[PDB]
Amino acid sequence: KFEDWLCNKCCLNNFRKRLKCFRCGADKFD
Ligand SMILES: O=C1c2ccccc2C(=O)c2cc(S(=O)(=O)O)ccc21
Numbered sequence: 368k369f370e371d372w373l374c375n376k377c378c379l380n381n382f383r384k385r386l387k388c389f390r391c392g393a394d395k396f397d
């Protein structure tokens with residue numbers, strides 16, 4: 368299940384395996 372997620376900081380789709388964003392490092396809940 369690669370239900371990737373969209374950061375709420377830089378708006379970049381990051382993989383699901385990645386708990387943190389791969390641009391600003393901000394967690395999905397931060
Ligand atoms: O090439 C990538 C890509 C391409 C098209 C859509 C999404 C991604 C992606 O999330 C990604 C993350 C990462 S990671 O370092 O966050 O795992 C590396 C590469 C990609």
Ligand SMILES: [Zn+2]
Binds near residue numbers: 375378
């Ligand atoms: Zn981000």
